[PDB]
Design a protein around this motif. Structure first.
Motif, PDB file in Angstrom:
ATOM      1  N   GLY C  65      -4.105  26.355  33.000  1.00  0.00           N
ATOM      2  CA  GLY C  65      -3.707  27.555  32.277  1.00  0.00           C
ATOM      3  C   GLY C  65      -4.626  28.763  32.248  1.00  0.00           C
ATOM      4  O   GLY C  65      -4.153  29.886  32.062  1.00  0.00           O
ATOM      5  N   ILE C  66      -5.926  28.561  32.428  1.00  0.00           N
ATOM      6  CA  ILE C  66      -6.856  29.685  32.404  1.00  0.00           C
ATOM      7  C   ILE C  66      -6.549  30.750  33.466  1.00  0.00           C
ATOM      8  O   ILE C  66      -6.513  31.939  33.161  1.00  0.00           O
ATOM      9  N   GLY C  67      -6.329  30.332  34.708  1.00  0.00           N
ATOM     10  CA  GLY C  67      -6.049  31.298  35.758  1.00  0.00           C
ATOM     11  C   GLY C  67      -4.883  32.211  35.422  1.00  0.00           C
ATOM     12  O   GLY C  67      -4.987  33.438  35.511  1.00  0.00           O
ATOM     13  N   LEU C  68      -3.768  31.603  35.030  1.00  0.00           N
ATOM     14  CA  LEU C  68      -2.562  32.336  34.669  1.00  0.00           C
ATOM     15  C   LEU C  68      -2.789  33.313  33.519  1.00  0.00           C
ATOM     16  O   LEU C  68      -2.516  34.511  33.635  1.00  0.00           O
ATOM     17  N   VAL C  69      -3.280  32.790  32.400  1.00  0.00           N
ATOM     18  CA  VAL C  69      -3.518  33.619  31.229  1.00  0.00           C
ATOM     19  C   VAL C  69      -4.369  34.846  31.540  1.00  0.00           C
ATOM     20  O   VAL C  69      -4.087  35.940  31.047  1.00  0.00           O
TER      21      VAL C  69
ATOM     22  N   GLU D   1     -11.217  24.322  51.627  1.00  0.00           N
ATOM     23  CA  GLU D   1     -11.871  25.144  50.567  1.00  0.00           C
ATOM     24  C   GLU D   1     -11.565  24.559  49.196  1.00  0.00           C
ATOM     25  O   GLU D   1     -12.475  24.244  48.429  1.00  0.00           O
ATOM     26  N   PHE D   2     -10.277  24.416  48.897  1.00  0.00           N
ATOM     27  CA  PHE D   2      -9.847  23.861  47.622  1.00  0.00           C
ATOM     28  C   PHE D   2     -10.327  22.422  47.470  1.00  0.00           C
ATOM     29  O   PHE D   2     -10.787  22.026  46.399  1.00  0.00           O
ATOM     30  N   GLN D   3     -10.226  21.645  48.545  1.00  0.00           N
ATOM     31  CA  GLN D   3     -10.661  20.252  48.521  1.00  0.00           C
ATOM     32  C   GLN D   3     -12.143  20.136  48.179  1.00  0.00           C
ATOM     33  O   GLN D   3     -12.537  19.323  47.339  1.00  0.00           O
ATOM     34  N   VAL D   4     -12.966  20.947  48.834  1.00  0.00           N
ATOM     35  CA  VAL D   4     -14.402  20.912  48.589  1.00  0.00           C
ATOM     36  C   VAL D   4     -14.730  21.369  47.172  1.00  0.00           C
ATOM     37  O   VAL D   4     -15.571  20.769  46.506  1.00  0.00           O
ATOM     38  N   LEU D   5     -14.074  22.431  46.713  1.00  0.00           N
ATOM     39  CA  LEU D   5     -14.319  22.924  45.361  1.00  0.00           C
ATOM     40  C   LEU D   5     -13.879  21.879  44.345  1.00  0.00           C
ATOM     41  O   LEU D   5     -14.499  21.729  43.294  1.00  0.00           O
ATOM     42  N   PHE D   6     -12.811  21.155  44.666  1.00  0.00           N
ATOM     43  CA  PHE D   6     -12.309  20.116  43.779  1.00  0.00           C
ATOM     44  C   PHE D   6     -13.346  19.007  43.655  1.00  0.00           C
ATOM     45  O   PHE D   6     -13.715  18.610  42.549  1.00  0.00           O
ATOM     46  N   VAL D   7     -13.810  18.513  44.800  1.00  0.00           N
ATOM     47  CA  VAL D   7     -14.812  17.451  44.831  1.00  0.00           C
ATOM     48  C   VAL D   7     -16.095  17.863  44.114  1.00  0.00           C
ATOM     49  O   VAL D   7     -16.640  17.099  43.316  1.00  0.00           O
ATOM     50  N   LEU D   8     -16.578  19.068  44.402  1.00  0.00           N
ATOM     51  CA  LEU D   8     -17.795  19.558  43.763  1.00  0.00           C
ATOM     52  C   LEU D   8     -17.618  19.646  42.242  1.00  0.00           C
ATOM     53  O   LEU D   8     -18.518  19.290  41.482  1.00  0.00           O
ATOM     54  N   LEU D  76      -7.683  27.723  42.699  1.00  0.00           N
ATOM     55  CA  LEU D  76      -6.555  26.893  42.295  1.00  0.00           C
ATOM     56  C   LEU D  76      -5.380  27.758  41.848  1.00  0.00           C
ATOM     57  O   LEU D  76      -4.219  27.397  42.050  1.00  0.00           O
ATOM     58  N   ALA D  77      -5.686  28.901  41.243  1.00  0.00           N
ATOM     59  CA  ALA D  77      -4.654  29.807  40.750  1.00  0.00           C
ATOM     60  C   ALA D  77      -4.136  30.765  41.816  1.00  0.00           C
ATOM     61  O   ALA D  77      -3.021  31.276  41.705  1.00  0.00           O
ATOM     62  N   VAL D  78      -4.939  31.010  42.846  1.00  0.00           N
ATOM     63  CA  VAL D  78      -4.537  31.925  43.907  1.00  0.00           C
ATOM     64  C   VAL D  78      -4.095  31.229  45.193  1.00  0.00           C
ATOM     65  O   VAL D  78      -3.186  31.700  45.874  1.00  0.00           O
ATOM     66  N   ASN D  79      -4.726  30.106  45.523  1.00  0.00           N
ATOM     67  CA  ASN D  79      -4.375  29.386  46.744  1.00  0.00           C
ATOM     68  C   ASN D  79      -3.493  28.155  46.529  1.00  0.00           C
ATOM     69  O   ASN D  79      -3.158  27.460  47.488  1.00  0.00           O
ATOM     70  N   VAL D  80      -3.113  27.878  45.286  1.00  0.00           N
ATOM     71  CA  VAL D  80      -2.274  26.716  45.011  1.00  0.00           C
ATOM     72  C   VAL D  80      -1.192  27.004  43.977  1.00  0.00           C
ATOM     73  O   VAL D  80      -0.123  26.389  43.997  1.00  0.00           O
ATOM     74  N   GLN D  81      -1.463  27.938  43.074  1.00  0.00           N
ATOM     75  CA  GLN D  81      -0.493  28.275  42.041  1.00  0.00           C
ATOM     76  C   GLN D  81       0.279  29.547  42.372  1.00  0.00           C
ATOM     77  O   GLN D  81       1.480  29.637  42.114  1.00  0.00           O
ATOM     78  N   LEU D  82      -0.413  30.526  42.943  1.00  0.00           N
ATOM     79  CA  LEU D  82       0.222  31.785  43.307  1.00  0.00           C
ATOM     80  C   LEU D  82       1.363  31.537  44.299  1.00  0.00           C
ATOM     81  O   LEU D  82       2.497  31.942  44.056  1.00  0.00           O
ATOM     82  N   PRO D  83       1.078  30.855  45.425  1.00  0.00           N
ATOM     83  CA  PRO D  83       2.108  30.569  46.433  1.00  0.00           C
ATOM     84  C   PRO D  83       3.296  29.792  45.873  1.00  0.00           C
ATOM     85  O   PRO D  83       4.446  30.198  46.036  1.00  0.00           O
ATOM     86  N   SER D  84       3.012  28.674  45.214  1.00  0.00           N
ATOM     87  CA  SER D  84       4.057  27.837  44.640  1.00  0.00           C
ATOM     88  C   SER D  84       4.939  28.630  43.681  1.00  0.00           C
ATOM     89  O   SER D  84       6.020  28.180  43.298  1.00  0.00           O
TER      90      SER D  84
END
Ligand SMILES: [Rb+]
Ligand SMILES: [Rb+]
Ligand SMILES: [Rb+]
Ligand SMILES: [Rb+]
Ligand SMILES: [Rb+]
Ligand SMILES: [Rb+]
Lengths: 91, 91, 91, 91
Positions: C65-69, D1-8, D76-84
């Motif tokens: 939710g942070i990104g969206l808000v 990118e997202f995968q690495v940021l997720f793991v980190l 996560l909000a731009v490369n996974v939530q924005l598109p969806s």
């Protein structure tokens, strides 16, 4: 750039540490902790300044210190953490 | 730009100060403190509005005031703090 | 853009309101307040979820939710507040 | 990118979880909760580290972890939530 932002951040935190331990009577480590969570906007869940001087200082401290602290965090993650990670992903 | 953002930030903080001291009964300095830590997202570790009117106002206050406050902090650190520092690093 | 971000923000807040009033037993207005200060990162100074389900949900709620808000707050201040102010400064 | 940021992000949260449950004695879920609200800057309204080791670690943890966590939230909000969402608005 990083060096200067580091030094500026350190000086700002020392000022807060001195202020809160003196005016609010916090142990130095607690004054530093409060200064850090305040400027990084995390906030502390238990302490709020109790004196009017402490409340006024905190208001001014926030407005003047937030930009810097996040400028340092921003550069630390992009000019010191990104590379050390980016170059690592290279097979 | 900075002047207008400054004035707008001041007006927003005065509104919060008046609201919280009136509806939540806080001393004016405490109402200002709460308004500032709320809009800068630092948050207060001890006070949460106790009335439903205070909770609703705070929700709206946050959404309308966060953008402005950070617009002011952003410009204050880049158009007033960066130069005073950047020009200083010049031997 | 603003309309969609508004609707998405509203839906996200309704979900939090329903979750916290049901699982954490908060009055609906309190559940909404907690959801708002959590997603805007202001945080609440008095309430922390007491159940493990509430703690796990809050962790996931924050990341999603942070990104969206902040996307909504960002556009609200630039595509709805900036103009209404920018055009105003015109003599 | 997202995968690495997720793991980190996951590794950073595991470290905090281990630290707080060990040094501050928190239940693992509480240590994870505190780590998450601290790095996302939401903050916890009830817990503040009680040991000096915990306060020092938290200060360092914040400076090193905030950039990453928000880098993950940002992507996560731009490369996974924005598109969806963006692709969804397509009639
Ligand atoms: Rb924050
Ligand atoms: Rb907080
Ligand atoms: Rb308390
Ligand atoms: Rb906060
Ligand atoms: Rb508290
Ligand atoms: Rb808090």
């Amino acid at each position: 750039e990083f060096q200067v932002l580091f030094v500026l951040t350190i000086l700002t935190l020392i000022s807060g540490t001195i202020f809160y331990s003196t005016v609010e009577g916090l142990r130095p480590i607690d004054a530093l902790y409060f200064s850090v969570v305040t400027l990084t906007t995390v906030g502390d869940g238990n302490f709020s300044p109790q004196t009017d001087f402490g409340k006024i200082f905190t208001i001014l401290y926030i407005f003047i210190g937030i930009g810097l602290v996040f400028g340092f965090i921003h550069k630390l993650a992009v000019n010191v953490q990104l590379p050390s990670i980016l170059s690592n992903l290279v097979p």
